[PDB]
Amino acid sequence: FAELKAKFFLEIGDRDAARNALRKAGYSDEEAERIIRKY
């Protein structure tokens, strides 16, 4: 779900909100950033 959130924000072109949702999960800002470059 938290991952669907992040994917949602990238889809609405809100890359920061995506980082906020992952860090909330919570994730490393390095792993989080990789996840994003990947989607």
Binding site: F1, L4, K5, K7, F8, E11, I12, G13, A21
Partner: protein
């Protein structure tokens, strides 16, 4: 001015006109408390009404005529069948159907005949008539026969040449003609008047018999909770919602169409896109009907899991993509929808207003369809998506209300009267 008024009471139909006509409903007729009745092809599906000079008179009723079978289209076009017959000594009147045409025939004492009819298109992408409840009114005076559809005049036939038409005959409600076994007809509010109803009066009756506390689905039947619905958009008729592959949003696609080669037929497919289901804020219960101003969740099925339609609480532009995701609570999204019907004229469209909760005065925006920028090496620079928009908040206040706004939705269930 009513001389016959068939209505439902206790698993039966009775005359409420006060003139006490005898009504025999045979076992082949299905009835419900919404005053709808069903004539089928089986022999016992009929109603006999025995009622206790040139006379003006009028008939009105609602009817719902099922779509043709694609593979049986020739006879649907060719074969006429009576559905209501009122004749004595080979004189009187009948209501018939030949495919996409509904017919009103007068027969004088000499057997001289005149007809007036209404025909709807069977090549429309999306029809307003096929398998949908619409309202019919036929009026007769000394010189004319008229058919009204949904309050509007459609056709006129000069009947000056005709002669005395006998009206006291028994009325037979039964499908009669060379029909297919799957053929049927729904009717509601059958009425007869001893005068020619004016266009003003028909229109008032249209609006009044259209009134219901509840909402309706695309076919015109009451809208239900816990029932599977495909979604139709009155502002974007050929479009539908599909959960985007690998993204939690609703992409909007173009309906597929009838893909064979009958030259009589064209339509867009109606059974596509996500199967939505309307739930309750609190929450599953028996025959729960959806009402104007109800609070709901708009849900849908995604591989035996129930997902829900959300809006981001904090979207920055005038409109934004909806979030389609598992049922879950989140600090970041609204899930509470209030179902509305802003139109003041008869309609099957409704609106979906997102809200903070059931007590709030704030309006977040209405669900609709908008175009969004596509990034990267793509074909198209813009694409349609399932959206929320503040703009409709403004547009729904304009009068008269716009029938075609992309914030106007209808719900389409599987129905035996539509096959594709």
């Amino acid at each position: 001015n009513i001389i016959l008024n068939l209505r439902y009471k206790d698993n039966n139909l009775i005359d409420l006109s006060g003139y006490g006509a005898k009504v025999e409903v045979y076992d082949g007729v299905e009835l419900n408390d919404k005053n709808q009745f069903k004539l089928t092809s089986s022999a016992n599906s009929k109603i006999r009404v025995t009622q206790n000079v040139f006379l003006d008179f009028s008939v009105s009723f609602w009817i719902r005529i099922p779509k043709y079978k694609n593979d049986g289209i020739q006879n649907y076009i060719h074969n006429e069948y009576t559905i209501i017959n009122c004749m004595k000594n080979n004189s009187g009147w009948k209501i018939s159907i030949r495919g996409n045409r509904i017919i009103w025939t007068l027969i004088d004492i000499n057997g001289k005949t005149k007809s007036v009819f209404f025909e709807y298109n069977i090549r429309e992408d999306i029809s307003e008539y096929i398998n949908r409840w619409f309202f019919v009114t036929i009026t007769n005076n000394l010189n004319n026969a008229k058919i009204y559809i949904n309050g509007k005049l459609e056709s006129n036939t000069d009947i000056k040449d005709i002669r005395e038409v006998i009206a006291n005959g028994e009325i037979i409600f039964k499908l009669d003609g060379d029909i297919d076994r799957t053929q049927f007809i729904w009717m509601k509010y059958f009425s007869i008047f001893n005068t020619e109803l004016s266009q003003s009066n028909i229109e008032e009756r249209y609006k009044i018999q259209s009134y219901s506390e509840y909402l309706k689905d695309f076919w015109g039947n009451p809208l239900m909770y816990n029932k599977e619905y495909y979604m139709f958009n009155a502002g974007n008729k050929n479009s539908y919602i599909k959960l985007k592959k690998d993204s939690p949003v609703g992409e909007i696609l173009t309906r597929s169409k009838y893909n064979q080669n009958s030259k009589y037929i064209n339509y867009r497919d109606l059974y596509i896109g996500e199967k939505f289901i309307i739930r309750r804020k609190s929450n599953s219960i028996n025959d729960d009907i959806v009402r104007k101003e109800d609070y709901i969740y708009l849900d849908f099925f995604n591989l035996n899991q129930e997902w829900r339609v959300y809006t981001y609480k904090y979207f920055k532009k005038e409109e934004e993509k909806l979030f389609l995701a598992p049922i879950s609570d989140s600090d970041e999204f609204y899930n509470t929808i209030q179902i509305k019907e802003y139109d003041e004229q008869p309609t099957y469209s409704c609106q979906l207003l997102f809200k903070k909760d059931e007590e709030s005065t704030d309006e977040i925006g209405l669900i609709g369809i908008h175009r969004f920028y596509e990034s990267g090496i793509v074909f198209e620079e813009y694409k349609d998506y399932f959206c929320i928009s503040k703009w409709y908040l403004k547009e729904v206040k304009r009068k008269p209300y716009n029938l075609k706004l992309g914030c106007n939705w209808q719900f389409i269930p599987k129905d035996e009267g539509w096959t594709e």
